[PDB]
Ligand binder design. Sequence first.
Ligand code: NA
Ligand code: NA
Lengths: 10, 250, 28
Amino acid sequence: GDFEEIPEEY
Amino acid sequence: IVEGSDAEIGMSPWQVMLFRKSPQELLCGASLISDRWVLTAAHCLLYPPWDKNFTENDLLVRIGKHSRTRYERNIEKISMLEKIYIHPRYNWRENLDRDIALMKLKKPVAFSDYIHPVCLPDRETAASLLQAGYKGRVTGWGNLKEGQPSVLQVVNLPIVERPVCKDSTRIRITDNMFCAGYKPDEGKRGDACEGDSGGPFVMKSPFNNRWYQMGIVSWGEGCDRDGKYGFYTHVFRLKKWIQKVIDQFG
Amino acid sequence: EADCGLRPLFEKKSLEDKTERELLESYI
Ligand code: NA
Ligand code: NA
């Protein structure tokens, strides 16, 4: 939530 | 980590972040011990009183990180879990005895300037270094006070005599645990805290100048309280189980 | 792994981090 989104690949 | 400092870049290249897929959040710390094995605390993965029981598919491992929240393009690597292994005598009912788990990655991770495994101690290094007064280092993205940091935090803490450890708590402490921290009189302070869980307590051997993981962040009562100490899983004591897991399922 | 515990940006370049000496000094 506070976190930058990681690549959907992951 | 409370009363710690921002890590230097590449100062803890074995530091691992255990990350929940949904909702995307930090779950725990952890550590890289080979290109395919990550060490953590069992309570990070299994803790029935709080309805915690994560399966492989719920989690990702993020390695080579510095920033807590940012996605570190070209630096961090994000890995999937093949299988989780929890100590079969992990005591979540009473005192977190044998608080240790292994995670095998789906694919080997690529070592880099930011990603590198830590050593696990042999008996002689353990005997030489796990002494009252000898300092270790603890690292984590956990809370800053009993509220989160922007980058990986670091704190150096002295190992504490077993009698003082025992006399600080009502909990039953075992040979599979050790405690670290300053005493009220020593003046200085610092501690691990929630979110620092499963992260490594490391020491730099003066014999061969390599870093060894002597403990795992396990538990405490509050964080950085006077008269209280952080408790760590004794890695060398559970070494046999570790080797076995990696030999069998290697 | 055989190279375990040696950090690329410190030990392998013979650089010291800012507080590792505090650990050494405690190994009494
Ligand atoms: Na006691
Ligand atoms: Na304390």
